[PDB]
């Protein structure tokens, strides 16, 4: 028999390691944390002029939101959103108000996780609340479409549509994480990383070879899943022409949170 | 359908004067059929629950067996000449749902209509699905 | 393809699933899953088969392309379609007959 004598692999194998956050990622995180930390000029709970007049200026300052805790500030913000989107003065359970409050709670927990990145139970709580918000949006879409659009517009969250059942392809599926992606650009998308899509090894400055388990996230384009203008055509892509809505760019996209081919949704927490 | 498959349990109680079951219009209609067939002493409708007053004879209960045919995960339908064969030589009650209401297999056989087989009461050991 | 035996074709389950499948002129009902292309829609239609062994019926989906002369069938609308007997272009094989349910627009 003729064969080349083989031996156990002699070489260097890359060290699996976490993907570093890019400067844009870090800046976006800092922007979100600063915006969350911003304290407006208002008092806590529902104190008003007559209530606060009786007290002395020092105690009124103690009542002011500057002395207030994070929970009190969060409750104040939720109260403001409720007063914006409520049916009547005490309506807190209508699906619009529920959507607003769930969004606020999700944002508060995301900030808390960015601080206490080692608090694992809150990631589970965040996932549960994302699912609840998804169900509330699905219900409100069918119940009242115009109000659903108005609420999504006011909250600056993606207006996902449930006209037809979602898909089993993660490149097309809805992303409750990607919702409220305007606030956080790092919760938008991510490149495939399994099997053939795994990041390739790189030699670092120290001289050792490391392989990232995830692809370092790149800043997504501002044209992600937005309507586009199309030129008239008659081809494989358009075997019957192009609609005037496609030509004008006025058409509707039901899943603005779709990751897209070659992209997975952003991680729950990173 | 789920409520009827649940009410089977409440109907199969022993050593009890009365037992409660979940409420549903289908349950009410099946109870009407049972009372017309003289298998229960009576029943009462109370909001979310129905209280069935059961009937006994010489200690043992009148209802000795319930076999469920049509489950919410699987319908069972029969033509008249299949219902005749399946209910052959049996004194039990096979409850049938048709376009004419919830009736007995004997009414269904005389009418020659296609029906959905829900339950079999005191049918001994006679089933096919 | 599946062939049912003579005695099997007389059973109530087979007959009822056949009745559910059949409509006048072999028409079908579905909902729109694609409305990008002009005068065309992709429609998902519920179709049922009766399994003799387990004596129950399961549902699957049939997705076909139909012709919509006007522009009245959007995504998520329930429609009734009819076959043509010929293929207009590379895709379209049915023709819209009527709109049953319309998802709200605007």
């Amino acid at each position: 028999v003729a064969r080349l004598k083989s031996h156990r692999y002699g070489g260097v194998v890359a060290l699996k390691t976490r993907a570093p956050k890019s400067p844009w990622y870090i800046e976006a995180e800092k922007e979100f944390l600063n915006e969350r930390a911003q304290v407006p000029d208002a008092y806590i709970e529902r104190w008003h002029g007559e209530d606060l007049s009786k007290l002395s200026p020092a105690l009124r300052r103690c009542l002011h939101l500057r002395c207030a805790s994070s929970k009190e500030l969060h409750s104040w913000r939720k109260l403001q959103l409720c007063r914006l989107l409520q049916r009547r003065p005490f309506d807190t359970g209508s699906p619009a108000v529920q959507l607003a409050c769930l969004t606020e709670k999700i944002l508060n927990v995301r900030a808390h996780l960015l601080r206490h990145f080692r608090d694992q139970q809150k990631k589970k709580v965040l996932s549960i609340w994302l699912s609840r918000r998804h169900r509330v949006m699905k219900y409100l879409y069918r119940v009242d479409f115009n109000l659903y659009k108005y609420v999504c517009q006011q909250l600056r969250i993606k207006c996902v549509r449930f006209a037809i059942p979602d898909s089993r392809d993660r490149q097309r599926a809805i992303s409750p994480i990607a919702v409220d992606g305007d606030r956080c650009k790092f919760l938008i998308r991510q490149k495939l990383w399994k099997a053939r899509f795994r990041p390739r090894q790189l030699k670092q400055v120290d001289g050792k070879v490391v392989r990232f388990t995830r692809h370092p996230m790149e800043q997504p384009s501002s044209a992600w899943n937005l309507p586009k203008e199309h030129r008239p055509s008659l081809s494989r892509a358009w075997p019957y022409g192009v609609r005037e809505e496609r030509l004008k760019g006025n058409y509707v996209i039901q899943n603005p949170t779709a990751a897209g081919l070659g992209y997975c949704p952003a991680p729950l927490f990173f | 359908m789920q409520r009827a498959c649940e009410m089977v349990v409440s109907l199969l109680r022993v050593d009890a004067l009365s037992q409660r079951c979940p409420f549903h219009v289908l349950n009410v209609q099946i109870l009407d059929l049972l009372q017309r067939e003289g298998l229960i002493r009576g029943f009462k409708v109370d909001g979310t629950k129905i209280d069935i007053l059961l009937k006994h004879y010489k200690g043992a209960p009148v209802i000795r067996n319930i076999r469920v045919v049509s489950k919410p995960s699987r319908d069972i339908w029969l033509t008249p000449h299949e219902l005749k064969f399946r209910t052959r030589f049996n004194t039990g009650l096979w409850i049938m749902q048709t376009s004419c209401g919830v009736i007995s297999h004997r009414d269904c056989l005389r009418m020659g209509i296609g029906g959905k087989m829900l339950m079999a009461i005191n049918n001994g050991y006679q089933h096919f699905c | 393809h599946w062939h049912y035996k003579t005695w099997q074709r007389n059973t109530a389950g087979y007959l009822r699933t056949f009745m559910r499948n059949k409509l006048p002129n072999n028409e079908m009902i579905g909902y729109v899953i694609n409305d990008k292309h002009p005068k065309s829609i992709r429609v998902a239609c519920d179709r049922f088969m009766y399994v003799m062994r387990y004596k129950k019926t399961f549902r699957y989906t049939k997705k076909v392309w139909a012709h919509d002369e006007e522009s009245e069938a959007r995504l998520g609308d329930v429609v009734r379609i009819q076959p043509l007997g010929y293929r207009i272009g590379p895709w379209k094989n049915y023709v819209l007959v009527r709109v049953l349910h319309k998802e709200p627009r605007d």
Partner: peptide, 19 residues
């Protein structure tokens, strides 16, 4: 009512709310 597929559920709705 057995097959509550998407089309079946859309067609089976008497009203917006089930009060």
């Amino acid at each position: 009512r057995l097959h509550n597929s998407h089309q079946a559920r859309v067609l089976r709705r008497r009203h917006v709310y089930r009060d």
